[PDB]
Design an enzyme around this catalytic site. Structure first.
Site, PDB file in Angstrom:
ATOM      1  N   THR I  31      -5.561 -15.966   1.712  1.00  0.00           N
ATOM      2  CA  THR I  31      -5.937 -14.843   2.578  1.00  0.00           C
ATOM      3  C   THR I  31      -7.449 -14.615   2.589  1.00  0.00           C
ATOM      4  O   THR I  31      -8.134 -14.918   1.612  1.00  0.00           O
ATOM      5  CB  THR I  31      -5.215 -13.562   2.110  1.00  0.00           C
ATOM      6  OG1 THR I  31      -4.026 -13.377   2.877  1.00  0.00           O
ATOM      7  CG2 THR I  31      -6.090 -12.344   2.261  1.00  0.00           C
ATOM      8  N   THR I  32      -7.968 -14.084   3.694  1.00  0.00           N
ATOM      9  CA  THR I  32      -9.412 -13.873   3.829  1.00  0.00           C
ATOM     10  C   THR I  32      -9.867 -12.516   3.305  1.00  0.00           C
ATOM     11  O   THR I  32      -9.190 -11.510   3.497  1.00  0.00           O
ATOM     12  CB  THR I  32      -9.924 -14.129   5.281  1.00  0.00           C
ATOM     13  OG1 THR I  32     -11.268 -13.648   5.418  1.00  0.00           O
ATOM     14  CG2 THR I  32      -9.041 -13.459   6.318  1.00  0.00           C
TER      15      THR I  32
END
Ligand SMILES: [Mg+2]
Ligand SMILES: [Mg+2]
Ligand SMILES: [Mg+2]
Ligand SMILES: [Mg+2]
Lengths: 244, 250, 242, 243, 241, 198, 233, 111, 244
Positions: I31-32
């Site tokens: 995930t960012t």
């Protein structure tokens, strides 16, 4: 992690052998020959210094014949550095014993203890075996003159005459052939040198190529005596035995 | 974490060879030539200060080391291995001996201690052997002057003279020619210098050469006086100048 | 050469699955649980006529109300019993009561998955799983007569009947047909002796098979040869009958 | 198996590949650095390169303060550099406590080199992929440059340079010291020796620098400090009004 | 420090190190044990690769554990010493804390326990030794004989042999041992023992050794001439028909 | 304290040891054997602090029994006491020392000579013609100084003991309930069971 | 690839994966199904128990950790014993030392941290078990899903084990119905047996087969087996 | 010098009826001559129909009460929710107590 | 002959440590997450992949607080970053205990730095499968940092990592050009919600939940606090409005 790089030194082969002990025994076969012969009135230790120069200090040298206490000595074949590690602990076990019992350690007890250390490295710890074979020459008042051999496996045995290192096959047959039980010590000196003359890979057998020691007993004394031969004396004993 | 390598990294190969010891000796073989010669009244150790840059100061790196005021060392092989072998050798000379008997160890015993330190790198879990061969030169009251070689195997032998490293085979031949049991110390220094010229490619003077002796006591390097039974150290490392004097009349 | 507690891509432990193989090669052992006792039977399987067949201990007492049968590498079981007997005796000391069979079994099985180094766990000193499965039979006041199958996998099952060893897959299918909730003790003693006779290679005498039971009244008893001898005698008659 | 290439044991030719590869890692930053000795000071110059615009440029440094007197510059990746810097600061603090006098440049170097030699021999430790240059004005030896590597090697330099273009700079200085015949820079103020270094870095590498392209550390009697961009800007201004 | 798991399961459910341990025993010199009505007799063969041996001092194969129990073995001689020493220690400890010497089954259960542990403890390899343990429980006259193998397994035997060519000597014994009536004499039990080795030794003038245990710590070993008298009377009897 | 006596005659060693076991106010037993046989030809008697006295004796016994089986050999009495002395000398600097004084009487088979060794709880060993531990000495030594000849027979030695035991039964404040006497000679260890009426 | 990088958990694949962990996750899939779901007043665990023979017990899948918290296991049962035992201790520690009932959210953090330690060290092995954790703490009903990888997630409902994908879709659809079952236990369990039924090729779920546990508002964590679950089949 | 023990007074009584039991105690906790609390119960319900008091030094009393209560909890966890019978509980406590045989819980205890 | 990428502490022939490079892969896969250093504080935002309607909203918290004043957000193997923050909390408490003053952010950074680097030193451990963005307000300013699996960390004006890492850095670089002046605490909260929204373009097939936190000298007293309710919804809307 680590498992990748482990030689596993203490494992059995499919034939029930210990690789490392066998290759260690293979190592020893290349080392210079040592011989011990036990007579009625003493023991002889003879050994071949493997590789020499004319610049090698002959007097202040020791690589095959070592003293453990006043009554026990060893001939070495294999890794010299490994042997000293074992020799020192042996010298110590002999002294612990004296401290405890106020008597000199009986040869077998010394040999077993040392061999038990060897068997250890064979069965646990994952270290390499000691690449060393020992002839033990000793005297105690239980069994008189005694001769013993031990190797990397942890096995010791007793002998009337024995050899370790290079050409033990050749040497062992030659000894079996000329050994009589009621040998006097000066006969045994002669036989030890002959056998080494006959197995060497050198031109001949000079004094600079030898280590030589006897456990005797000056007949008018009643007590034991160890004599490591000085380089000059080995040259004397080489002449009389008829190999100039 | 933790040294999870608790097993030997030196083992026996089917032929009976100890692989890692063989390869250690190979590293010694590539090392810069060093040699030692024993006279009747002294010993000499010499080596080439191969400089890895003309921007380096070659004094700041001694290849010849004092171990006790009566014992000196030199080597061929991996510098760093030697450096920590010199620190351990110095220490064991106190812990295992001086702090027990109030005197420094004789040459053989200290040698034997280094030999033990190397032997263990040949068997302990998770180490390679030491990549050096040592030449150790010493004096002690009861044994006189002596010279000893220590191999990565932990094996040691006494020498009348020998060399190690690069041109050692040539040098050992050179040395057999020129040695006798009647040599004065000055004569062995002269022979040492000559033997080392064979192996030295570039410049050959008291800046590119390191040379040390085990002579008689220097009552003047002691640092104090008043105690008449302390004449001082027998180990003296010669100066850049002292070396050149023996070369200008080589 | 991977680790010991490596997982297979199927999602099962390598060493625990191979130990189960070692067990299949083992002597047959059979346990049947009634409302009158639990019966344990084993194949002795002496490897020679010269072996004294009663020095073979494949049925052992844990307490007076718990005994077990073993199958597989049977030396591996020595320390499992030592711990079990201890667990029981210890529990009695702390509590002035008999240990529950399900508790004794749970205690034995805890031991079974302790094969590590101490790293990322606690302390797990032991190199390989046990090469032996156990049938643990006993009685307690909460659950009456019980039979448990203890594995090297750490898991343990309760059974009305179970068979482990070389005959294990064939003997089980047999138990499946015979077993009903109303079985008497004598009926179970015969059933054990019947199914052993089938899967054994040898001709079943009172020497290459052993019987035992645990009832609430007389505790856990091993049947001596004479008594086992007369129960074979009785099976032959009842099988010839029809 | 070719496992003699993964841990620190001997190859048949007698080399330690892991050591050799660790040298490769030092050049991986692509930072060039040099050190020179003044009349009574020592200066280190390093290329400061800030590739990312998102970086805080003030936190991007390969020059470390080890003690009041010792400074250290590192050629090699930052995480191994900080690992090395910390040990050095700890080693230097403890020296003082135990022995009652500031840890000398060369001794710290010897120690750090002794730690390196250990990763060379003990199998479970990997070497640190860095080359460590130490500087100070030693109270006993005068101004000092001492450098160590993953091999466990250490020596003292008159001047030295390190990084991918180690050699250009090294030869540049090799030349200078022959014409000048002395083994230092004959200059009293450190500001002039800081300039001298920046100059021969331009002339060797063949590049120009702004105050944001360099990193400078200076050692004097009793102090080691690093210049800010403004202190360098003064230096870059000074060089440019003559050459 | 070193705890690598050497004794492990393989996919066929086998523990290769223990099976290879047995292979070491297989190549060990043959040992045999048979029991009479009032004695157990232990026989071993001697190797004749090299025989310039000092038989006064050389370790013999039959070892005393306490004064009433003996232990012979087949396999690695070095490993055997680690068991004999441990077992002797455990014998004295038992006398100390229980005030009675060990039963023969106990001393056996103990040795076996040790052997087993070496098959599931990290960093250690199994014992390449099998044993025969013989003797008399204290205050008992009913003779005992037990066998252990590297796996940790043990059991008693009317007679048993281990080591090289033990199929041949076991074969001989399965034919020639009657459990209805065991050897009734010391003499007729020693004879049955020499006979079984003669199927493997080929002249045991000095390559056969025999030890005779009796109730109440009565243990003596025979010398060459005494054994020679048996070899003599066996082959002369076998000659004619 | 308990009475522990020993006398080395010519053919043998004689050991006398009080029979009483007193705890506090009561004599709990009057037939106590304050001895252990260490090997066929070596005997040890002991007196001291409650538990320690036996626990040490039995310990030494097991250790010599182990040594005998390991070597198929009986140590010389000289070696046994050297072992015992070391054990006690170790014990004194430990966290809780064994408080046990012992007499070791043995017959040496090599030299064919009897030997008597006295070791106290500190590890103080000496070889003697006759010895005693505790207060016993203060009465008996002077009487033995007088009547002892190195060439006495087992019979004469027992007569000389009978004289020591009488002197103690006379002047000692405590009733030590008679003694148990044992002889150590070339034929092993035997007990003179009739010392109550002899 | 694959082959070379799965000898232990200390190794990354070139893709960036821990194969030993993913093989641990495979033990879950190979294991018997179990379901969890909560409203605002209660939280239910339902489990299909699996037997070896037809002569064997149905091995129990639900464990009580404290009076206000319990879990269901899918996968290696001895590992669920190790972890619940650890969790019991943490619940117990909190009551004794802080006189505070352990927050369910925190039990997750504790388990994750314990599981994670096994995925980074040599000679270790991941936990081979999936866990569903229910509890009623000081902020209402809670349900947690725990993975051997260390990933603990808070959901309204979920399932793990064999064929669990059927139950998981069902709950995703029934979400708005079951979230509102506040104050009726019996009806929330009904919706948990209905949910576990989407995961059956096997057979009818019987008396010895079913296992249900409940916790919330006015109910301490308690387990039902036998005629206890009769009224639910 | 620090004395680890104190005395909090109090008195407890336990009478076993023919099919019932009572365990009573005063609610008074005291140090020396001062009163600390007039209501501080020292007779506790531990479940499985076992009531307990550990009277004497109040800190050791609470420590023992707490440790035994936890023994009950963990008995259920370890033995499939079995009832801890009174005789079992007693033996369990003997072990809890003797466990500190060389630094005793300074309490006369009654269940 | 290769096999350079199997053990953790091994140098490849070109000087790289492949295991650390493979660790990075697990990060990039994750995930960012981002961090923005303003003129008096720091903002931390993360993407939260909603796999299902079953995940409880607001509940599965990803951002961690260390001490009272430091915020941490990390991309990749979630349990690793949890473990790393655990070590970060121990490190922060230990420092406070000895020195009284709560740990400075540079000081703190190196603590993680040293510990993470130390997991690339031996084959007996694996590297951390996370990149960590962390910071806070100390005795002289706000600080923003990012830490790679290698042990590398630097101070950032803005930092980004994970699946949306490349589009984020582009948005971040823009901001650094427009406002070389500063950029307030209140503005950067909205601007972080935008940069997370734009970076969700990569994980587009799954729905997501935004989570913001900040540590501002003026807006939070120099203490770490989550963005909630009104200020959260106001920044979500700012992101939606500006996505078109
Ligand atoms: Mg970057
Ligand atoms: Mg290394
Ligand atoms: Mg390593
Ligand atoms: Mg009860």
């Amino acid at each position: 992690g680590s498992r990748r790089y482990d030689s596993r030194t203490t494992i059995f082969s499919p034939e029930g052998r210990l690789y490392q002990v066998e290759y260690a025994l293979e190592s020893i076969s290349h080392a210079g020959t040592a011989i011990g012969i036990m007579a009625s009135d003493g023991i002889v230790l003879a050994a071949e210094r493997k590789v020499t120069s004319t610049l090698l200090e002959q007097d202040t040298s020791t690589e095959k014949l070592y003293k453990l206490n006043d009554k026990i000595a060893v001939a070495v074949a294999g890794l010299t550095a490994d042997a000293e590690i074992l020799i020192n602990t042996a010298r110590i076990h002999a002294q612990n014993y004296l401290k405890t019992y106020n008597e000199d350690i009986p040869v077998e007890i010394l040999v077993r203890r040392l061999s038990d250390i060897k068997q250890g490295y064979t069965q646990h710890g994952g270290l390499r075996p000691f690449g060393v074979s020992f002839i033990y020459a000793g005297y105690d008042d239980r069994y008189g003159y005694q001769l013993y051999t031990s190797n990397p496996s942890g096995n010791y045995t007793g002998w009337k005459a024995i050899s370790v290192g290079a050409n033990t096959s050749a040497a062992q047959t030659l000894l079996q052939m000329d050994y009589k039980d009621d040998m006097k010590v000066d006969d045994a000196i002669e036989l030890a040198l002959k056998t080494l003359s006959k197995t060497t890979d050198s031109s001949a057998l000079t004094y600079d190529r030898l280590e030589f020691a006897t456990i005797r007993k000056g007949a008018n004394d009643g007590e034991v005596y160890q004599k490591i031969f000085k380089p000059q004396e080995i040259k004397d004993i080489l002449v009389k035995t008829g190999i100039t | 974490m933790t040294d999870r390598y608790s097993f030997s990294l030196t083992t026996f190969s089917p032929s009976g060879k100890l692989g890692q010891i063989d390869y250690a000796l190979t590293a010694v073989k590539q090392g810069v030539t060093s040699l030692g010669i024993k006279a009747t009244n002294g010993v000499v150790i010499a080596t080439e200060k191969k400089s890895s840059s003309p921007l380096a100061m070659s004094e700041t790196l001694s290849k010849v080391s004092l171990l006790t005021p009566d014992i000196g060392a030199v080597y061929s092989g991996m510098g760093p291995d030697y450096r920590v072998l010199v620190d351990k050798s110095r220490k064991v000379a106190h812990t295992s001996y001086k702090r027990i008997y109030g005197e420094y160890p004789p040459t053989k015993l200290l040698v034997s201690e280094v030999a033990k330190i190397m032997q263990e790198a040949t068997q302990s879990g998770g180490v390679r052997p030491f990549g050096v061969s040592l030449l150790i030169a010493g004096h002690d009251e009861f044994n006189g002057f002596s010279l000893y070689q220590v191999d990565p195997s932990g094996s040691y032998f006494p020498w009348k003279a020998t060399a190690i490293g690069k041109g050692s085979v040539a040098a050992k031949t050179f040395l057999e020619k020129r040695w006798n049991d009647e040599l004065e110390l000055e004569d062995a220094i002269h022979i040492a210098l000559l033997t080392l010229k064979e192996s030295v490619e570039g410049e050959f003077n008291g800046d590119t050469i390191e040379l040390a002796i085990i002579g008689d006591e220097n009552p003047d390097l002691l640092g104090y006086t008043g105690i008449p039974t302390d004449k001082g150290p027998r180990f003296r490392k010669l100066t850049s100048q002292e070396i050149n004097d023996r070369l200008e009349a080589l | 050469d991977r680790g010991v507690s490596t997982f297979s891509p199927e999602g099962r432990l390598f060493q625990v699955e191979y130990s189960l193989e070692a067990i299949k090669l083992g002597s047959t052992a059979i346990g049947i649980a009634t409302k009158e006792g639990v019966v344990l039977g084993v194949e002795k399987r002496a490897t020679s006529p010269l072996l004294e067949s009663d020095s073979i201990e494949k049925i052992v007492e844990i307490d007076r109300h718990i005994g077990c049968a073993m199958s597989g590498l049977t030396a591996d079981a020595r320390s499992m019993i030592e711990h079990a007997r201890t667990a029981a005796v210890t529990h009695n000391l702390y509590y002035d009561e008999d240990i529950n069979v399900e508790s004794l079994t749970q205690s034995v099985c805890d031991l079974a998955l302790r094969f590590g180094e101490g790293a990322s766990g606690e302390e797990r000193l032991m190199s390989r799983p046990f090469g032996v499965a156990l049938l643990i039979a006993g009685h307690d006041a909460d659950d009456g007569y019980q039979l448990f199958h203890a594995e090297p996998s750490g898991t343990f099952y309760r059974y009305n009947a179970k068979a482990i060893g070389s005959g294990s897959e064939g003997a089980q299918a047999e138990l499946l047909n015979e077993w009903h909730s109303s079985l008497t003790l004598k009926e179970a003693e015969l059933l054990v002796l019947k199914i052993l006779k089938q899967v054994m290679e040898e001709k079943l005498d009172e020497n290459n098979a052993q019987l035992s039971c645990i009832t609430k009244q007389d505790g856990f008893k091993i049947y001596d040869n004479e008594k086992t001898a007369e129960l074979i005698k009785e099976l032959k008659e009842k099988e010839a009958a029809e | 198996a070719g496992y003699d290439r993964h841990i620190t044991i001997f190859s048949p030719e007698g080399r330690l590949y892991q050591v050799e590869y660790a040298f490769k890692a030092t050049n991986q930053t692509n930072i060039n650095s040099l050190a020179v000795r003044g009349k009574d000071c020592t200066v280190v110059i390093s290329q400061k390169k800030v590739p990312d615009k998102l970086l805080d440029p003030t936190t991007v440094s390969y020059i470390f303060c080890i003690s009041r007197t010792i400074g250290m510059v590192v050629n090699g990746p930052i995480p191994d550099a900080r690992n090395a810097a910390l040990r050095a600061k700890a080693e230097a603090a403890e020296f003082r406590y135990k022995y009652g006098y500031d840890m000398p440049c060369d001794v710290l170097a010897k120690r750090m080199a002794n730690l390196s030699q250990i990763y060379t021999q003990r199998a479970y430790m990997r070497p640190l992929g860095v080359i460590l240059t130490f500087v100070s004005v030693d109270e006993e030896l005068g101004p000092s440059i001492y450098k160590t590597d993953p091999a466990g090697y250490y020596v003292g330099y008159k001047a030295t340079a390190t990084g991918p273009k180690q050699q250009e700079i090294t030869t540049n200085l090799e030349n200078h010291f022959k014409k000048s015949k002395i083994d230092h820079i004959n200059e009293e103020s450190w500001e002039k020796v800081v300039e001298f270094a920046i100059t021969h870095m331009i002339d060797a590498l063949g590049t120009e620098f702004s105050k944001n392209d360099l990193e400078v550390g200076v050692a004097t009697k009793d102090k080691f400090f690093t210049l800010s961009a403004e202190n360098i800007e003064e230096r870059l201004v000074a060089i440019a009004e003559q050459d | 420090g070193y705890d690598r798991a050497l004794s492990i399961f393989s996919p066929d459910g086998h523990i290769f190190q223990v099976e290879y341990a047995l292979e070491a025993v297989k190549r060990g010199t043959c040992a045999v044990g048979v029991k009479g009505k009032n004695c157990v007799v232990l026989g071993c063969e001697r190797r004749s690769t090299l025989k310039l041996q000092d038989t006064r001092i050389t370790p013999s194969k039959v070892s005393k554990i306490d004064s009433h129990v003996v232990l012979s073995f087949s396999g690695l001689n070095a490993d055997s010493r680690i068991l004999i020493e441990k077992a002797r220690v455990e014998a004295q400890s038992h006398r100390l804390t229980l005030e009675d010497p060990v039963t023969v089954e106990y001393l056996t259960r103990y040795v076996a326990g040790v052997q087993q542990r070496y098959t599931q403890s990290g960093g250690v390899r199994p014992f390449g030794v099998s044993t025969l343990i013989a003797g008399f429980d204290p205050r008992d006259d009913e003779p005992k004989l037990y066998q252990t193998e590297p796996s940790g397994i043990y059991s008693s035997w009317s007679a048993q042999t281990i080591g090289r060519n033990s199929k041949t000597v076991r074969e001989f014994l399965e034919k020639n041992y009657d459990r209805k009536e065991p050897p009734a004499t010391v003499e007729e039990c020693v004879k049955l023992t020499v006979r079984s080795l003669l199927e493997v030794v080929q002249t045991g003038a000095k390559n056969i050794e025999i030890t005779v245990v009796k109730p109440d710590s009565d243990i003596v070993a025979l010398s060459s001439e005494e054994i020679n008298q048996y070899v003599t009377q066996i082959e002369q009897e076998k000659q004619e028909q | 304290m308990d009475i522990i006596l020993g006398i080395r005659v010519q053919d043998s060693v004689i050991l006398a040891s009080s029979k009483a076991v007193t705890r506090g106010i009561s004599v709990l037993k009057d037939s106590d054997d304050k001895t252990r046989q260490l090997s066929p030809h070596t005997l040890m008697s002991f007196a001291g602090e409650a538990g320690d006295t036996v626990q040490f004796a039995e310990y030494i016994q097991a250790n010599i029994q182990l040594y005998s089986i390991r070597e198929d050999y009986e140590l010389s009495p000289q070696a046994v006491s050297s072992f015992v002395r070391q054990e006690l000398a170790k014990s004194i600097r430990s966290r809780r020392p064994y408080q046990v004084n012992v007499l070791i009487g043995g017959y040496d088979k090599k030299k064919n000579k009897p030997e008597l060794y006295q070791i106290d709880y500190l590890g103080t060993k000496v070889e003697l013609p006759y010895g005693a531990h505790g207060y016993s000495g203060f009465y008996t030594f002077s009487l033995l100084d007088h009547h002892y000849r190195p060439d006495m027979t087992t019979e004469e030695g027992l007569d000389l003991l009978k004289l020591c035991v009488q002197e103690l039964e006379k002047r000692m404040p405590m009733d030590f309930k008679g003694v148990i006497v044992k002889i150590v000679d070339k034929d092993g260890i035997r007990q003179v069971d009739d010392f109550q009426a002899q | 690839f694959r082959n070379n990088y799965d000898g232990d958990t200390v190794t990354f694949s070139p893709t960036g994966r821990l194969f030993q962990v993913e093989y641990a996750l495979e033990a879950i899939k190979q294991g018997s199904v179990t379901v969890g779901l909560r409203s605002n007043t209660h939280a239910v665990l339902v489990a299909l128990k699996r037997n070896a023979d037809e002569l064997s017990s149905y091995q129990k899948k639900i464990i009580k950790c404290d009076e206000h918290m319990g879990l269901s296991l899918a996968g290696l049962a001895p590992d669920a014993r190790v972890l619940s035992n650890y969790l019991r201790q943490q619940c117990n520690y909190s009551s004794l030392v802080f006189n505070r009932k352990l927050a369910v959210e925190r039990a997750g953090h504790l388990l994750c941290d314990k599981a994670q330690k096994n995925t980074q060290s040599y000679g270790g092995r991941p936990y081979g078990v999936g866990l569903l954790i229910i509890g009623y703490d000081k902020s209402g009903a809670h349900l947690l899903e725990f993975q051997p990888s260390g990933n603990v997630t808070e959901l309204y409902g979920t399932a793990i084990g064999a064929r669990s994908q059927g139950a998981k879709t069902y709950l995703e659809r029934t979400l708005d119905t079951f979230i509102k079952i506040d104050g009726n236990p019996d009806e929330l369990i009904k919706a948990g047996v209905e949910a576990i039924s989407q995961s059956l090729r096997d057979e009818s779920l019987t008396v010895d087969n079913l296992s249900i546990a409940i916790v919330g508002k006015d109910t301490p964590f308690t387990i039902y087996d036998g005629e206890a679950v009769a009224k639910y089949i | 010098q620090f004395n680890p023990y104190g005395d909090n007074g109090g008195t407890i009584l336990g009478i076993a009826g023919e099919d019932f039991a009572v365990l009573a105690g005063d609610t008074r906790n005291i140090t020396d001559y001062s009163i600390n609390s007039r209501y501080e119960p020292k007779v506790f319900d531990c479940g499985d129909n076992i009531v307990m008091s550990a009277n004497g030094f109040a800190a050791d009393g609470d420590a023992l009460v707490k440790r035994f209560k936890n023994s009950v909890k963990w008995y259920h966890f370890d033995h499939n929710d079995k009832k801890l019978s009174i005789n079992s509980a007693a033996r369990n406590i003997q072990h809890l107590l003797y466990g500190k045989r060389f630094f005793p819980y300074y309490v006369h205890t009654i269940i | 002959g290769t096999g350079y990428d199997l053990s953790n502490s091994v140098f490849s022939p070109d000087g790289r440590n492949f295991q650390v490079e493979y660790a990075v892969k697990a990060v990039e896969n994750g995930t960012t997450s981002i961090g923005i250093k303003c003129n008096d504080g720091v903002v931390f935002a993360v993407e939260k992949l909603i796999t299902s309607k079953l995940l409880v909203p607001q509940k599965n918290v990803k951002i961690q607080v260390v001490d009272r004043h430091i915020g941490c957000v990390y991309s990749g193997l979630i349990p690793d970053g949890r473990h790393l923050v655990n070590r970060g909390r121990e490190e922060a408490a230990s420092f406070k205990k000895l020195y009284k003053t709560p740990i400075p952010i540079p000081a703190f950074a190196d603590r993680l730095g040293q510990y993470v680097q130390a997991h690339t030193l031996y084959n007996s451990v694996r590297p951390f499968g996370v990149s960590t963005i962390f910071g806070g307000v100390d005795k002289n300013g706000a600080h923003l940092y990012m830490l790679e699996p290698s042990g590398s960390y630097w101070g950032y004006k803005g930092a980004a990592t994970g699946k949306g890492r490349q589009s984020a850095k582009a948005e971040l670089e823009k901001l650094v050009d427009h406002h070389p002046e500063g950029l307030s605490a209140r503005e950067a909260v909205k601007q972080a919600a935008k940069i997370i929204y734009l970076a969700h373009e990569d994980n587009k097939e799954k729905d997501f939940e935004l989570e913001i936190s900040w540590c501002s000298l003026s807006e939070t007293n120099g203490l770490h606090k989550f963005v909630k309710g009104d200020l959260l919804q106001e920044a979500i809307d700012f992101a939606q409005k500006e996505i078109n």
